[PDB]
């Protein structure tokens, strides 16, 4: 069309500024109703593609890889995702001591599954698809793909002819989705402009005071996470870090602007295609990654728990701090669903951190974080989306 | 089977008489529980086919036409649909002055979007399909069809092979639906018999009095609409009017008997196929037409607003009358959904006509219209369905 | 893997014993939360496959059989299913006089559709699939299959090419489900172990007393049903009874263990494939059979009505007894849906048997049956699943 | 025997609804006289 | 007066407890919520 990747940067910088201006003069609503819609439409289109592209891609990927292999890749990636997720909150806490974000806050307070695994097996695969539901889709999509392999090896040609057909056909759909992700991308500059403008209009005005301290703490945390873990692990597995960022650029910017791992999945999955990773590998991991792995979100969980505990002048035993890591890692898997999951998890860490949300001051401090949540979420997600790409590139390198 | 198109006329004439008899003797319920079901079953079958036939046909159509072309055809048709819709209410009003339907009615009364466009983009195409949802389907079906074109041009043969497959396969389904629409048609005589019998049993008994005047006004309005606009525009674009009616006959009769533009879409879409219009053209316009364009319904909206305003001896400023047109045109697009949309729109024109529905006399008059709604709706729909066919034949002629 | 069919028997015998032990010591809950889940996962997997495997298989079957033929086979099987169902309750009653199960129970009590056919026609085929809904699926699947035949006879090759494709592709999916049903089967021994263990834990402890008498009466009833009707009708149609049981063995054991006709439908449909019955025949009848025909459940309905009527010392006129048969046969078709349908039907026979459930003693006796319901349901289902297989083998023999 | 659900039956009913107070005023003044009268008569019998 | 003349429109188509209630169960409750009849009863 015109510039194109700049087009996005022009829109992002220009937007986040125009929004910050508009917001300061109390036009946040004016934006919301006039500007924000154009952003939605971007997210809309992306969502749309997810379900076919996840489904179709995985059948094909799973068909054209060995079974034990997924086994490998699965175990690898699951083990990966957890180490990065666990490590990432520890870097959050480390970032949280560096900036003391709960200083003042001159206020205080005293006071006091199997089913989930079962659910991965959809009872209606059609039903599965139809209502969002990424995980049961992943499950069935692999089962289907594997099946197909066995059908094309079958002695009967009349059989392999149907199996080939169905495969091709599914790939048709799969491929055609990658096609559309480029379409949907061309509207990305316009889309991106509206998304960040709206978020700066909403919670720009908020980054003032001790709340800037928490934001800075997160964002340095994320920047540090990328260089200390992702760049280190990329070098350590013989893949060039700076080339990676060239490739992931759209995935990463879309992730940052939408704040939806799910929503950004077709961009992320096109990036892995263009990096020339096999469908067998990314098709299984990236969608598993959208739901299982939430590194960047788990980082900010770490720093926010501190903001609140510092706020009330809570001890926060060093022994306690590691339980912050454990639960918030357990929480990210548990909140696969990204509807302000970040704030939910937070409410959760406090349910077990011992600080009841019902107590006003605990609420008060939570309230503040709520006012800054998108600003955090944008970052947290771009780190989340890099996390999977990285893992997937590493796990692909081992094959 | 037996006669066949007569079979329908025998059933229609025979039915609408038998129903009118049964009704006069208060057997309207007897009919309802014994006869009407047979009519349902006809509507049923038709419904069923819509979703696949709309979706499948459009992917193929959109695949096998130029992109800018849809652009053209879309603009053409959208512009068309509005002129015909706007014009049609003016002919309603013109018909409404001709017959004064609110004479007596010797009673009086005094007293005093973005989101929508967003919604066209489905977030789950599967979900879209599953729950009725024709528009988001139309969107995604075009997106898919276009994508496919680009896939069959791709340098990689392994690609074009999948794309071809998926295309073919979709057309298989598409074609197969046209197949079934002839099946479903063979039961049309029986189906038609029950539908009109039921409607004459229910609101035959009602066409007495000033209510006949509104009915006559509508029906002449519709007859006039066909000759003054559809026949005039057919000649004016070099297509033979009398031949058109030969072709549209089933589409038209089904439309009249069912009262669902949606429901009648497979018949209408088969009629366009048999007229030899390209799938690229009718596949996009006819389903758009089912929801956007409601000429015949908008005509009766015009005449009914008058019945009510005359009823209360309201001024109805000539300046006011044009706002009747504007809102009722804006309303037909808004109530794409045909569950007694006609009566809903009417309630809406009054919400803005200034006559509150809460006032008993305003309600009283409204009530009367309610009692005659099907009798109007049958007509109004047969005009609606001709409207799209015509538009689609004209737009096709331009290509 | 390892043994395999024994693997199932080892797990069944070992489980039903281990469960009975664990239950007697009040660990029923311990089982429920620790063991039962492994059983679920088995049912889960089987369910999943049903919808595609029913749908895909039938399109193909219906495509590749004559229309009038389904006509035949449908009529045959419908007439079959009813005779077997009617007969089976008469054998229940005959079994109920043999064992007097309402003896003591030294307690007494005195005191005092079209729509359904319409529903078979889905309005959204996609919607049909998506939400369970087997029947409207069957309907549309046949309509689709037949359609396709007509498309491959069509003069235009470009047509037959799509029709072939779509067919192939659907068969791909169909075949692939059969593939997965073997997968799902390999986990059957583990699956079966949890299912029966949980049911013995829950209602083992209950088979004590007059309740054993009803259980025995049912179970002899089912054993008798197989030999007196299924074996007799197999010989009488020239098919070897003992070979049948060899083939049906997985179908029958899965049916017994899950208690879901629906759930066991992919095993049952694989058994008919491996018996070499045509897809045209079993594809239409076995799914119809999962919902229409419930012989074994209707047998225990017959014996339970007696338990309760004996309990209160009700007359139970011999004329009354036949109305027990009629309604309980009408009830099985009516409760196609297997969520404890058996107890629902029972509540229904009493709604019309004259004994109101509201009366405590009527309830009391009902309560007892509720406590034994699974133990009965297991049996009743394994007879239900045999019922269709048999019918299907017989109707297949006539072709 | 005239069901209110039938629109025209409703329509006519609607009209009456619009005049209901005008009727109710009168209807009540006659209602209140009714008891007073009855009460005066029954009092006269004692 | 023929009041349904026109109206040029047409249409075809197709206790013990109460006595018990007079006896309030709470006279105070009776008073408190409107309730004229049970009041009359108790008052007598
Ligand atoms: Na992620
Ligand atoms: Na229309
Ligand atoms: Na069955």
Author numbering:
A (entry chain A), B (entry chain B), C (entry chain C): 9 to 120, 130 to 416
D (entry chain D): 371 to 416
E (entry chain D): 107 to 120, 130 to 159
What does the paper say about this structure?
Therefore, we crystallized GltPh-R397A in the presence of 400 mM Na+, but in the absence of L-asp. The structure of the Na+-only bound GltPh-R397A shows HP2 in a conformation overall similar to that observed in the fully bound transporter, but with an opened tip. Indeed, the structure of Tl+-bound GltPhin is indistinguishable from the fully bound GltPhin and both Na1 and Na2 sites are occupied by Tl+ ions. The structure of Na+-bound GltPh-R397A differs significantly from the fully bound GltPh-R397A only at the tip of HP2 (also see below). Therefore, opening of the HP2 tip upon Na+ binding in the outward-facing state may serve as a structural mechanism preventing uncoupled uptake of Na+ ions. We suggest that the structural changes in the NMD motif and HP2 that are triggered upon Na+ binding at the Na1 site may lead to the loss of direct interactions between the tip of HP2 and the rest of the transport domain, resulting in tip opening.
Glutamate transporters, or excitatory amino acid transporters (EAATs), reside in the plasma membranes of glial cells and neurons, where they catalyze the re-uptake of the neurotransmitters glutamate and aspartate (L-asp).
